[PDB]
Amino acid sequence: FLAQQGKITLILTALCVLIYIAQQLGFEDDIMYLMHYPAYEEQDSEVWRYISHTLVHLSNLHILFNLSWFFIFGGMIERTFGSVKLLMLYVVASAITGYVQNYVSGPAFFGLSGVVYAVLGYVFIRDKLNHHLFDLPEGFFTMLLVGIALGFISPLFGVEMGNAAHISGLIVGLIWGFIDSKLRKNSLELVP
Numbered sequence: 001f002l003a004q005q006g007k008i009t010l011i012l013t014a015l016c017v018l019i020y021i022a023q024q025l026g027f028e029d030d031i032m033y034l035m036h037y038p039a040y041e042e043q044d045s046e047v048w049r050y051i052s053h054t055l056v057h058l059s060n061l062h063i064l065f066n067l068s069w070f071f072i073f074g075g076m077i078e079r080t081f082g083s084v085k086l087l088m089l090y091v092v093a094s095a096i097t098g099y100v101q102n103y104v105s106g107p108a109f110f111g112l113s114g115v116v117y118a119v120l121g122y123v124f125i126r127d128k129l130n131h132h133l134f135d136l137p138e139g140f141f142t143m144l145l146v147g148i149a150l151g152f153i154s155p156l157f158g159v160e161m162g163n164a165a166h167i168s169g170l171i172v173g174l175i176w177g178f179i180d181s182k183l184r185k186n187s188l189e190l191v192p
C-alpha cells in the first residue's frame with residue numbers, strides 16, 4: 001500500500017504486476033506484440049514502444065527481483081527528489097536502454113531491469129556525493145552491486161534482455177545523478 005511510498009513507484013509496480021498476470025491468463029502473445037520495442041520501420045511511429053517493453057516480464061523471478069529492487073530504490077528516489085524525477089528517469093532510462101539493447105541484440109527484450117540499474121546508478125552516485133539524503137541501503141543491496149557486475153558480463157543469472165540494457169542503465173543513472181548533484185551544489189552556494 002501507499003500511505004507512505006511514492007504514487008508513481010506504486011503505479012509502475014502495480015502496472016507491471018497487472019500486465020504479467022494478464023500474460024498468464026490468455027496470452028503473452030497480444031501483449032508482447034503491442035509492447036515490444038520497435039522492430040519494424042512502420043513501428044518507429046508507435047512511440048509507446050520505446051518505453052512499453054519495460055512493463056512485460058518473462059518469469060516469476062524476473063518480475064520478483066525487478067519489482068523488489070524498483071519498489072525499494074525507485075521509492076527512495078520518489079520520496080527524496082519527487083514524483084516527477086522518478087517518472088522522468090523512468091521514461092528516459094526506458095527509452096535509452098531499449099535503444100542500446102536493440103542495437104546490439106535486436107527488439108527481442110522485455111522487463112524493468114534497465115530502469116532498475118538506472119535507478120540504482122542514480123541513488124549510488126547521489127549517496128556517494130551529497131551523502132545525506134540517504135542513510136545506506138541495508139548491507140546486502142550494497143553488495144549485490146559488485147557481485148552483480150558478473151550477473152551480465154559472465155552470466156550468473158540472466159535478466160531476459162542482456163547486459164547492454166543494464167550497463168547503459170547504470171550509465172544513465174550515474175550521469176543524471178552527477179548532474180543533479182552538481183545543480184544542487186551550485187544553488188546552495190548562496191545559502192547560509
Ligand SMILES: CCCCCCCCCCCCOCCOCCOCCOCCOCCCCCOCCOCCO
Binds near residue numbers: 017058061067071
Ligand atoms: C530483507 C530485505 C527486505 C526487502 C524486501 C522488499 C519488499 C518490497 C515488496 C516488493 C513487491 C514485490 O512484488 C513482486 C511480486 O511479483 C508478482 C508476480 O508473480 C510473483 C511470483 O512469485 C514468485 C513465484 O516464483 C515461481 C518460481 C517457479 C518458476 C520460476 O519462474 C518461472 C515462472 O513461470 C510462471 C509460473 O506461473
Ligand SMILES: CCCCCCCCCCCCOCCOCCOCCOCCOCCCCCOCCOCCO
Binds near residue numbers: 163180
Ligand atoms: C565469448 C564471450 C562473448 C562476448 C560477451 C561480451 C560481454 C559484454 C557484454 C556487455 C555489453 C556492453 O554494452 C555496453 C553498452 O554501453 C554503451 C554506453 O552507451 C549507452 C549509454 O548512453 C548514455 C546516453 O547519455 C546518458 C544519458 C544521461 C542523461 C542525463 O540527463 C541529464 C540530466 O539533466 C538534469 C535534469 O535534472
Ligand SMILES: CCCCC(=O)OC[C@H](COP(=O)(O)O)OC=O
Binds near residue numbers: 015035052
Ligand atoms: C507507458 C507506455 C506503455 C503504454 C501501453 O501501451 O501499455 C500499457 C497498456 C495500458 O497502460 P497505460 O499506462 O497505457 O494505461 O496496457 C495495459 O492494459
Ligand SMILES: CCCCC(=O)OC[C@H](COP(=O)(O)O)OC=O
Binds near residue numbers: 038095099
Ligand atoms: C533514443 C530513442 C529514440 C531514438 C530513435 O529514434 O531510434 C532510431 C533507431 C536508429 O536511429 P539512427 O539514429 O541510427 O537513425 O532505430 C530504432 O528502431
Ligand SMILES: CCCCC(=O)OC[C@H](COP(=O)(O)O)OC=O
Binds near residue numbers: 179182183
Ligand atoms: C556534466 C556537466 C557537463 C555536461 C553537460 O554539458 O551537460 C549539459 C546539460 C546539463 O548541464 P548542467 O549545467 O546540468 O551540467 O545536459 C547534460 O546532459
